[PDB]
Structure 1
């Protein structure tokens, strides 16, 4: 035991992140749920001493159990360990001296799923959404996930709803509440509500999460993207028949606007054998070549 994997959630909270609570002014709620809410806010003096900036602030309800408080702190420590990357919603600060507040970047265009549904009607393959945009988004998300995988981290809730868009058509992966550093055991074994239609079969049937199950979810994200924000497995409810069809190899067909090479990636992401799925590193190089040929 002279060498070990450093567990990022065991490391101390770095007080370089600490920011005064009184310098945040809370605005409109950006997301809400059982644990708490994410709210838009103006932070005075966060980056430059005399300037206010718009941030997103994640917070728990007062009623949350101390285990929920630990999970928010673990997320904070995971983001601190990961460091900065262009394609992830980056940590900006925290308030840990009343309730724990986690301050991240504010993405002005919101989640990609609603963005696609807004732009669906005016989409043209060739300020309109185009096929070039969709290729860039697929590429940027794969870069972000490749970065996560290189840090021995799995996200576990990859989907268009958890991809945010900000200035410059930059996509950022958000919501790291379920992310895990799996360096030690090569997978993660998880009773909350789960995103069944984005989950690999091994995650549904045996509660196993890996690099490869993140790649499955990325395939579903691609289908969301090139169908311009449609719900996956349309007209199929989550029931006994859904699980049986997935187990027996049923897969979604190519969305209307997906290039053949992109649906090829989707199919490999959805292989029943996790070993046969590609890595995010391989996906990035594939999409690179596709972009290079217009």
Structure 2
């Protein structure tokens, strides 16, 4: 009898691209064994043509296989290489896509109440992750998927890493294409990643969410307005120095102050003096 978490390459047919990075990409595929365009749609993550990167995909697969939560995207299966070494990650396709693509088109349908509900839902997926001894390192609006207008999910686990029991953080080596405008100062300075660093990133993600992922008011474009548009190599050190001074992203327009103070609490300098995902749920719930 057949394994349902096993997708043969021959039946996996590409439709379009959904996203890519400097290492791997995610496509839309129909798994169509019958060969009649009736099969189920899926998100297929794979590597671009990388010895060190096949290791990373296997880890990601094995992390995502064992996460079971309403607000985390669902592992469907794997597709193996015919020789052995290569591999693909098969996930559920959510056709409304990331918040980045969704919010600009559905501003009429989505109001402050609904944005705060998404926010709660992101904190619940993130607290499940954290409690399973994992640090995400990549929480942006672009990795939050829309299941429906009442449901979002964390849809990417590319940079997700185990924190050891003894240690209280993870130290990264390959920081080369990091999302710097989403990062806490310890990530920028010591290359260190605490659960509290994911909370930093949530605050920025929450900023994007509250501005309907308008490019013109995005974390990059507002940080680059503050520090300087054209500093090249010195961008990241100049970012670290404005955060040291106490400069943070401004209140989104039509965001009430009480929401903004929950956002501000995400962005305290020291990881230990920073709010928790549980505390954030209770603050959002009280507003709703």
- For residue 137 of structure 2, the aligned residue among 156, 159, 173 is 156
- For residue 77 of structure 1, the aligned residue among 33, 43, 62 is 62
Match of 1:5 in 2: none
1:243: how far off? 2.3
Match of 1:142 in 2: 123
TM-score (norm 2): 0.85
- For residue 102 of structure 2, the aligned residue among 103, 108, 115 is 115
In structure 2, what is the Cα distance between the partners aligned to 1:265 and 1:132? 15
Within the alignment, does 1:42 sit opposite 2:23 as a pair? no
1:254: how far off? 1.4
Aligned pairs, number: 265
Equivalent runs, 1:123-272 vs 2, <5 Å: 123=107, 128-184=109-165, 185-190=167-172, 191=174, 192-229=176-213, 230-232=217-219, 234=222, 235-236=225-226, 237=229, 238=235, 240-272=237-269
1:239: how far off? 5.1
- CA 1:93–1:268: 2 relative to 1, 3 Å: same
- CA 1:149–1:45: 2 relative to 1, 3 Å: farther
Match of 2:72 in 1: 88
Q: Secondary structure at the match of 1:110?
A: coil
CA contact (8 A) 1:108 1:167 kept: no
Give the alignment's Cα RMSD to 1 decimal.
2.1
In structure 2, what is the Cα distance between the partners aligned to 1:257 and 1:45? 50
In structure 1, what is the Cα distance between the partners aligned to 2:33 and 2:76? 12
Equivalent runs, 1:11-90 vs 2, <5 Å: 17-44=5-32, 52-61=39-48, 63=49, 65-82=50-67, 84-90=68-74
Q: Secondary structure at the match of 1:22?
A: helix
Q: Which aligned segments of 4 or more residues in structure 1 are displaced greater than 4 angstroms?
A: none
1:131: how far off? 1.6
TM-score (norm 1): 0.83
CA contact (8 A) 2:22 2:177 kept: no
Q: Which runs of 5+ in 1 are unaligned?
A: 1-14
In structure 2, what is the Cα distance between the partners aligned to 1:182 and 1:206? 16
Q: Which runs of 5+ in 2 are unaligned?
A: 230-234
